[PDB]
Amino acid sequence: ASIKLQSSDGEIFEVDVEIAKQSVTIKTMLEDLGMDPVPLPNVNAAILKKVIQWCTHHKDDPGTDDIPVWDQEFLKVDQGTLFELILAANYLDIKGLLDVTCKTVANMIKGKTPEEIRKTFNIKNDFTEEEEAQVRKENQWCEEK
């Protein structure tokens, strides 16, 4: 019923087998490679925690395309944490969490102009004067009506 997980930075977590195995990566490390404890060198402890909350909420699961409220609430965190979750969810292979963290980023892009997108995510405009002219032209077609 319980196995040990190890954070990138040393903290150990006793987690239920069946919760832990929602992460296909861990399940491989536990069954195929026989690890116990499972070192996760890419996931820090604060992130592991949240990922254990999520998987635990989601332990029983028979979805749709519209983010459940409970998960919306789980994701009321700052950008940097949201991207650490995406990366953690990619590394651990937890499809549900990846999906829900990515839809969430996507809704933050839905309908924004290039300007608003750069401010939302602090991305520097790294185009040269020519390139930028060039991208504009390549994408005029979108303001067609």
Partner: protein, 418 residues
């Protein structure tokens, strides 16, 4: 700690971008160097074409023709998104049906004509009127496909929301070496498959001739107004859509059945000069069922009339405050192959008018349900029967956005022919 979007591996970013509306991709492309570069990944646009426009492009076709799905979305799909759907041409009283549709690297304006009179169960004939073709490096071309001497130059103009027009730039192709006599026989052959004669009836002979001349005046420079298929409902319903119906000498017309409370509407999609395209041809009073007597009373014309005017009567008082079937003697039917069992009958009224849609009025009659996709209307005051049968084709992009929107579309196409 403080990660940004810009640090995610390309593969994750593609996942996320491939999930967004195509119309958000071009903003993402202008945000930065990395996004422009990533957004050259065709998989993303191949998904955008599938999910938004229904089209699964072939990869091998893409390679041969040098076209990409980024191109398709931008230069075909989005460029022309507003002419997609189901349409009715504005051709005086006669209407028509165009379904404008995506196939591969084409958009195709398909015209659907009715089968030959009186074979209401035969399928719709269908031919392209125009196409729009994307090729590598180029803007999509517009070509007219009418009539016999191959694809040739055309134009399209998107007027609004719900109207567009085609022009043909080179009609020399609609002509035929014999001349306009021959245009007329091929035309007669495809719409009637009868002899320049056979019928004799000068009247249908005349109607056919005038229609030929009136429509062929639109060479093929037409305006199309948007129309929708009717909303499905479970209870208040027994199966809407488009039917093909016998309209005597005018031949077969296309009629859209739709449900509106405990009342069904028959709406003309094609029409004639008595009652034009876009008008209510029929109305079924779905709470005034009429009982089918044995078969030798069914045969009795006057019994049937007494019974139908007695319901007309009671209806007029309120708006103040399978089993064997046979037509009655004296009631004609162009078909004769109308079913001999039916489920139910109901009171209804047809719209009639003299030529030019002059002085229209509702006459009583009785609606007859045979099968799921087969019904009829006995026209009392004309002693005449109409057999309707379901158009079996299937139509892309044809759904009303909403119910009130369908009831608005009906109102617009009725008014253009008022």
């Amino acid at each position: 700690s403080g990660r940004s979007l810009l640090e995610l591996p390309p593969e994750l970013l593609v996942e996320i971008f491939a999930s967004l509306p195509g119309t958000d991709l071009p903003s993402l492309a202008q945000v930065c160097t990395k996004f422009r570069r990533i957004l050259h990944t065709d998989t993303i646009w191949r998904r955008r074409c599938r999910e938004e426009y229904g089209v699964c492009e072939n990869l091998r076709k893409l390679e041969i023709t040098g076209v990409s799905c980024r191109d398709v979305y931008a230069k075909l799909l989005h460029r022309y998104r507003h002419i997609l759907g189901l349409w009715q041409p504005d051709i005086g009283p006669y209407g028509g049906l165009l379904n404008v549709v995506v196939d591969g690297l084409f958009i195709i304006g398909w015209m659907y004509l009715p089968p030959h009179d009186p074979h209401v169960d035969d399928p719709m004939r269908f031919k392209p009127l125009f196409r729009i073709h994307l090729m590598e490096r180029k803007a999509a071309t517009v070509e007219c496909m009418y009539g016999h001497k191959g694809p040739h130059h055309g134009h399209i103009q998107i007027v609004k929301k719900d109207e567009f027009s085609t022009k043909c730039n080179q009609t020399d192709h609609h002509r035929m070496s014999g001349g306009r006599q021959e245009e007329f026989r091929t035309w007669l052959r495809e719409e009637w498959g009868r002899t320049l004669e056979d019928i004799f009836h000068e009247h249908m002979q005349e109607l056919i001739l005038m229609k030929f001349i009136y429509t062929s005046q639109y060479d093929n420079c037409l305006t199309y107004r948007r129309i929708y298929l009717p909303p499905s409902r479970p209870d208040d319903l027994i199966k809407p859509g488009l039917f093909k119906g016998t309209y005597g000498s005018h031949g077969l017309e296309i009629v859209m059945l739709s449900f509106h409370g405990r009342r069904a509407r028959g709406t003309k999609i094609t029409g004639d000069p008595n009652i034009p395209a876009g008008q209510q041809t029929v109305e079924i009073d779905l709470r005034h069922r009429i009982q089918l007597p044995d078969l030798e009373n069914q045969r009795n014309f006057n019994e049937l009339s007494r019974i139908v005017l007695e319901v007309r009567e009671r209806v007029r008082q309120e708006q103040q405050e399978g089993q064997p079937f046979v037509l009655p003697v004296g009631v004609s039917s162009r078909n004769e192959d109308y079913p001999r069992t039916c489920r139910m009958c109901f009171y209804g009224t047809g719209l009639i008018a003299g030529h030019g849609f002059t002085s229209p009025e509702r006459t009583p009659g009785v609606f007859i349900l045979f099968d799921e996709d087969r019904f009829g209307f006995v026209w009392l005051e004309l002693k005449s029967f109409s057999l309707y049968s379901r158009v079996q084709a299937t139509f892309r992009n044809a759904d009303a956005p909403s119910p009130q929107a369908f009831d608005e579309m009906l109102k617009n196409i009725q008014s253009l022919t008022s």
